[PDB]
Design a protein around this nucleic acid. Structure first.
Lengths: 274, 267
DNA sequence: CCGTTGAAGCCTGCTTTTTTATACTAACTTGAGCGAAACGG
C-alpha cells in the first residue's frame, strides 16, 4: 500500500534535490510544499478531489496573493505528474484547474523620483548613495553589484558575471548618465576614496555587504522622502529599469539590451510619412 | 478576471438568456440535447451571431464548474457553433458625399465628426474622447480604449478623394463647435458615442440610398478611410494609422464584401 | 432527304485547389422607457 499525500511530498522533495538547480531556487519550491501541507488533509492521492484543490487555491487568490496561487498550483501539479511516473495514481486532478492571471502592480521609477530619494538618503550611510548611482550607471542587478571586486576592473573595463542568467559582459569605465549628472568613472573613484575595500560596494567596516541590506535601507529612504505612487512603491531593482529607460533615449536601444545582459529582443509609436 | 466594464455587461446579457431558456436542474442532469434545443431556437430567428456567443459563454461556465468539483465533463463542447457571415455592407466614396449633403438638416457637429472619422480613421468611441490638449506641435496623440494602443496622427494629412484636410477640419471644430473636446455638442459639452452614430443613420435613410442586406454605419467611415489610404499613399500607411499591428486583418479590412468589383488595372 | 457516325453529356469514383480555424476580449447599434430642459400661452 503505502499511500497518502504527505508521505509523497516527503519523497518528492528529495527528487527535486537531485534535479540540480540553484540553492535559492530549491528553497522557493520547499516553501510552496509546506503551504500545501497545511492546505490539504493527509489522505491517499486517489482520494484528493479537484474541488479541494481549487478551494485552497482560490483561498489565496481572494486574500490578495494571486501570484502565490500560480506557483503553488504549478508546483503541486508537478508533484502529481511525478507521482504518476512512479505508478502511484493514474490522473492529475490539478490539470483540470485554471491558474489565476495576475498583473504586476509594482510601479516604475522616474528621473524626478530618483533625485528625491538620493537626497533623502542623507541620513543613510555613505555607501547607499554610491550603490544608487552605480546601479543606475551600470544598470546591473543588485545581486551582482555586491559581488563586484576591484579586481574585476581590467584596463578600463568592468567584468561582471551575472549570477541569475550567467551572462558575461564588460561595462567600460567611460559611461555617463546625461539626465541625473552621474559619471561611471567619477562614481567608481568616489567609492575608492570613501568606502575603500575589496569590493566596489562595501560597509563602513571595509567588508562586503549582503544583497538583502542594499535594498532594505533603500526602502527607508523611500518612505522617508514622502512620495506617493499608484500601487506598490518602486524598489532598488527599479533602478535597473530606470537605467535602461534612460540609456534608450541617451544612446540607443541596442545598447540598453547589451548593458542589462539580454541577448534576444522579446508606448507612443510614431507614424512616419513613408 | 479583471474586465473592461462594458465587456462584463455583455456576459451578463448572455447569462440572463440561459437561465430563461434552460431549467434550473442539476448540471450533471443537463444533457447535450436540451442545450442544442435552446441553441437552435435562436438560430432560426436569424440570430446566428447570438447563438455563437451564448454557447461560448455557457461552455466556459462549465469549465470553471469542473475545476471546483461539480461536474466531470462539459456537455457544451460537443455541440457545433453556428457560423455567421457579416451582412453589414461597405461604404463607398460616392456614397459618402451623398450622406454629407443629407446631414445639412442635421446639427453642425455631424458634418465635422464624419470628416474627422475619415481623415484620421479613428474609432467612434475614441473620437469623442479626444480633447484639444491631446494636440501638441501638430501631433494628435490618441490613446485607444479598445486595444489601448497609443498613436500620433500628424496634422499634415488630407484625402484627395473627398477633398478634406485634417488641419482645415480641426480648426473648423474650434469655432463652430467650441469646447473641451474636438467633437462637442450644441451645448459646448461632450457627446456620447452611442448618439454620434444615431444622427448618422437618420441622414442615411433620408438620403434615399439602397444597399444589399444591412446598411452601412458611422463605423464604416473607418473602413472607407483605410480603403482610400491604401491607394492614395501605400499599404504600410493605412496599417499604422488605424492602430493595427497584426498582418491577418490587413487583408480582411481590405475586402469589398461584394459592393464594388475590384477593378484590376494594368498593374 | 432519310439513315449512319461522331462531337458532346451525365453518372461515379476519384483527385485537387482555395478558405477558414478555436476562444476570450471589447465593442458597436436600434429599440423603448424616462427625466429635465426650453418654447408656446
Amino acid at each position: 500500500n503505502s499511500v497518502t499525500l504527505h508521505s509523497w511530498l516527503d519523497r518528492y522533495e528529495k527528487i527535486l534535490a537531485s534535479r540540480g538547480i540553484k540553492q535559492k531556487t530549491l528553497i522557493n519550491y520547499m516553501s510552496k510544499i509546506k503551504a500545501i501541507r497545511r492546505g490539504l488533509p493527509d489522505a491517499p492521492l486517489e482520494d484528493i478531489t479537484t474541488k479541494e484543490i481549487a478551494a485552497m487555491l482560490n483561498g489565496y487568490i481572494d486574500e490578495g496573493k494571486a501570484a502565490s496561487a500560480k506557483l503553488i498550483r504549478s508546483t503541486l501539479s508537478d508533484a502529481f505528474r511525478e507521482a504518476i511516473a512512479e505508478g502511484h495514481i493514474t490522473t492529475n486532478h490539478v490539470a483540470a484547474t485554471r491558474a489565476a492571471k495576475s498583473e504586476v502592480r509594482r510601479s516604475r521609477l522616474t528621473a524626478d523620483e530618483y533625485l528625491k530619494i538620493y537626497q533623502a538618503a542623507e541620513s543613510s550611510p555613505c555607501w547607499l548613495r554610491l550603490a544608487m548611482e552605480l546601479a543606475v550607471v551600470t544598470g546591473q542587478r543588485v545581486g551582482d553589484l555586491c559581488e563586484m571586486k576591484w579586481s574585476d576592473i581590467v584596463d578600463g573595463y568592468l567584468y561582471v558575471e551575472q549570477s541569475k542568467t550567467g551572462v558575461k559582459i564588460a561595462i567600460p569605465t567611460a559611461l555617463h548618465i546625461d539626465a541625473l549628472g552621474i559619471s561611471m568613472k567619477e562614481t567608481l573613484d568616489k567609492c575608492k576614496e570613501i568606502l575603500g575595500g575589496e569590493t566596489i560596494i562595501a560597509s563602513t567596516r571595509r567588508e562586503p555587504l549582503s544583497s538583502g541590506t542594499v535594498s532594505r535601507y533603500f526602502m527607508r529612504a523611500r518612505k522617508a522622502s514622502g512620495l506617493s505612487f499608484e500601487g506598490d512603491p518602486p524598489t532598488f531593482h527599479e533602478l535597473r529599469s530606470l537605467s535602461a529607460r534612460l540609456y534608450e533615449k541617451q544612446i540607443s536601444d541596442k545598447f540598453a539590451q547589451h548593458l542589462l545582459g539580454h541577448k534576444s529582443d522579446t508606448e507612443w509609436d510614431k507614424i512616419e510619412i513613408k | 478576471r479583471g474586465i473592461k466594464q462594458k465587456t462584463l455587461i455583455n456576459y451578463m446579457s448572455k447569462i440572463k438568456a440561459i437561465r430563461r431558456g434552460l431549467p434550473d436542474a442539476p448540471l450533471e442532469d443537463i444533457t447535450t440535447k436540451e442545450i442544442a434545443a435552446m441553441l437552435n431556437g435562436y438560430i432560426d430567428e436569424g440570430k446566428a451571431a447570438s447563438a455563437k456567443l451564448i454557447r461560448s459563454t455557457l461552455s466556459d461556465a462549465f469549465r470553471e464548474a469542473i475545476a471546483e468539483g461539480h461536474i466531470t465533463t462539459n456537455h457544451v463542447a460537443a455541440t457545433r457553433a453556428a457560423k455567421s457571415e457579416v451582412r453589414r455592407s461597405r461604404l463607398t466614396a460616392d456614397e459618402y458625399l451623398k450622406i454629407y449633403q443629407a446631414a445639412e438638416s442635421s446639427p453642425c457637429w455631424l458634418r465635422l465628426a464624419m470628416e474627422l472619422a475619415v481623415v484620421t480613421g479613428q474609432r467612434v468611441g475614441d473620437l469623442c474622447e479626444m480633447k484639444w490638449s491631446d494636440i501638441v506641435d501638430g501631433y494628435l496623440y490618441v490613446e485607444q480604449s479598445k486595444t489601448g494602443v497609443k498613436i500620433a496622427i500628424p496634422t499634415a494629412l488630407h484625402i484627395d478623394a473627398l477633398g478634406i484636410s485634417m488641419k482645415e477640419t480641426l480648426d473648423k471644430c474650434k469655432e463652430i463647435l467650441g469646447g473641451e473636446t474636438i467633437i462637442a455638442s450644441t451645448r459646448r459639452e461632450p457627446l456620447s458615442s452611442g448618439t454620434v452614430s444615431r444622427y448618422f443613420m437618420r441622414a442615411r435613410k433620408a438620403s434615399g440610398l439602397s444597399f444589399e442586406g444591412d446598411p452601412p454605419t458611422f463605423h464604416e467611415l473607418r473602413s472607407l478611410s483605410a480603403r482610400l489610404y491604401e491607394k492614395q499613399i501605400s499599404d504600410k500607411f493605412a496599417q499604422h494609422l488605424l492602430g493595427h499591428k497584426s498582418d491577418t486583418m490587413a487583408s480582411q479590412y481590405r475586402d469589398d464584401r461584394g459592393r464594388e468589383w475590384d477593378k484590376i488595372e494594368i498593374k
